[PDB]
Amino acid sequence: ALRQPQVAELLAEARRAFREEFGAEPELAVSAPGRVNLIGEHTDYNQGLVLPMALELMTVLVGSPRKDGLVSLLTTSEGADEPQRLQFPLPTAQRSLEPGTPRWANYVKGVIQYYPAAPLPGFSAVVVSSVPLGGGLSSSASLEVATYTFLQQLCPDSGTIAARAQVCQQAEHSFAGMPCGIMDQFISLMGQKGHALLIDCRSLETSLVPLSDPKLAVLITNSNVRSSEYPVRRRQCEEVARALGAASLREVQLEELEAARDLVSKEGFRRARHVVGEIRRTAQAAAALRRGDYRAFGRLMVESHRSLRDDYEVSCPELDQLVEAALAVPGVYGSRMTGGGFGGCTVTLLEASAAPHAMRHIQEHYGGTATFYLSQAADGAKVLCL
Ligand SMILES: O=C1CCCC2=C1C1(CCCC1)N=C(Nc1nc3ccccc3o1)N2
Ligand SMILES: OC[C@H]1O[C@@H](O)[C@H](O)[C@@H](O)[C@H]1O
């Protein structure tokens, strides 16, 4: 089941590490959670709908401003790239920051580089995280949003919440070489406890769908395996949208995609069929969840996974084996791969009482080492007072 430390443990760990690294007590502290997507995969960059929820796994940042004008960072996460420490001067008009080594610091460097407010002072900071790094629960986005929320303490920002999510997204593109969508940054910033967020990535309007049923559990199963094909999938969708004269696959419904089948590639048609169908499935999933129809929600999860496995082809044999094992347990409503795919985690919605047997059944039928997280919908990025 694997324990989830709470803000008190992470804050204390981060603050003890700060004292034993910089001599003084930290002056500021922030946290930003990871996320799991209940449904709506690879609709992100297609101006579609997603239904993520923030997790109890989070990244905590403690620090203090400096008069030096340098940034000094240390992270305690064991999976972090080596070295665990890095120091650099703040960017100027002449010289700007550039991505490099270690890779974990590029997320921090990107947000600093693209931070819209000034003057930004130097700072010392310690980073702690309970999000498994690169495990498909968007550890990077939690670090980007935590960094942004920390910098707001150094110098308050003026833009909208959407502008903050796009800054962290701009950091991921340039400093991490990953052309991701907006969901991970958005849900980390905007999550609310006991609620999933139906996010329209075209209008950035959000809808809060409550998930605070004690008889309901969300189970995260990390496959522990491992994105070469993610870019390619993005441009196949843009070519299909361009071929149909539309700005994005959000503007295309299944009937028009079927009517224009001969205007696009055979693979391109199979990618758009998932994207257009998945957008519709999340709208149906949100509605099913509002009225408490967990069985209908679970069936939409299974359709989403099979669609990702056959039409979008972004699943792997380990994920498919984890989903089929979970689907055999009654009291599991549905199971599905989450994140970009090619490994990572599977999300499962199930009855709370069935969680112990589900984990034993999933583990027994998996040809690897599966790690489990039982998570509730958590709050978004928040300032912590020391
Ligand atoms: O090389 C990769 C592979 C693709 C995914 C990705 C990375 C690494 C893991 C190792 C360094 C780079 N890290 C993240 N995210 C992340 N690193 C953190 C460090 C400290 C606190 C919170 C953090 O969240 N994502
Ligand atoms: O649905 C796939 C998702 O995969 C994530 O890893 C990515 O950061 C999101 O933007 C979204 O595209």
Numbering used by the authors: 3 to 228, 233 to 392
Published text:
GALK1 is a small molecule kinase of the GHMP kinase family, which catalyzes the MgATP-dependent phosphorylation of the C-1 hydroxyl of α-d-galactose to yield Gal-1-P in the Leloir pathway. In classic galactosemia, GALT enzymatic deficiency causes the accumulation of Gal-1-P, the product of the enzyme galactokinase 1 (GALK1; EC 2.7.1.6) upstream of GALT in the Leloir pathway. Here, we determined crystal structures of hGALK1 bound with reported ATP-competitive inhibitors of the spiro-benzoxazole series, to reveal their binding mode in the active site.
To this end, we co-crystallized hGALK1 with two spiro-benzoxazole inhibitors (T1 and T2), in the presence of galactose, and determined their crystal structures to 2.44 and 2.10 Å resolution, respectively. The benzoxazole ring, mimicking the adenine moiety of ATP, sits in a hydrophobic pocket forming a π–π stacking interaction with Trp106 and van der Waals interactions with Val129 and Leu145. The amide linker and dihydropyrimidine substituent of the quinazolinone ring occupy a similar position to that of the ATP ribose moiety. Both compounds elicit changes in the four active site loops involved in ATP binding. Importantly, the quinazolinone cyclohexanone and spiro-ring substituents cause displacement of two key side-chains—Arg105 and Arg228—at the entrance of the ATP site. In our costructures, both Arg105 and Arg228 are sequestered away from the ATP phosphate groups, to accommodate the quinazolinone ring of the compounds. Therefore, these residues are sequestered away from catalysis in the inhibitor-bound complexes. We observed dose-dependent inhibition of hGALK1, with IC50’s (T1: IC50 12 μM, pIC50 4.9 ± 0.2; T2: IC50 17 μM, pIC50 4.8 ± 0.1) similar to published values.
